[PDB]
Amino acid sequence: GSSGSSGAQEYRALYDYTAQNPDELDLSAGDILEVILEGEDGWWTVERNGQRGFVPGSYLEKLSGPSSG
């Protein structure tokens, strides 16, 4: 089980989000994504399987606890 030290701020969706435009990404409670940048307005930048999109942080959750979870 190789892991190392380097990682990435993972975020677990909280509620299913349907991207109206082909630009935004559809979220889903449980989906594991990464936050590239933080928007001051609300539009957060996250990537999933190489694909990039834009979704509101409100529909995100920072997973804390690399152990016992």
Per the DSSP assignment, residues forming a β-bridge with 55 are: 44
Complete DSSP assignment for 2-26: ---S----EEE--S-B--SSSSS--
Identify the three-state secondary structure at position 42: coil
Statement: 1-69 belongs to CATH 2.30.30.40: yes
CA gap 28, 30 in Å, rounded? 6
Sign (positive/negative) of CA torsion 1, 36, 21, 13?
A: positive
Experimental method: NMR
Phi (first) and psi of residue 13, to 5 degrees: -45, 155
> Are 25 and 36 a contacting pair, CB within 8 Å?
no
Q: Is the torsion defined by CA of 58, 64, 68, 69 positive or negative?
A: positive
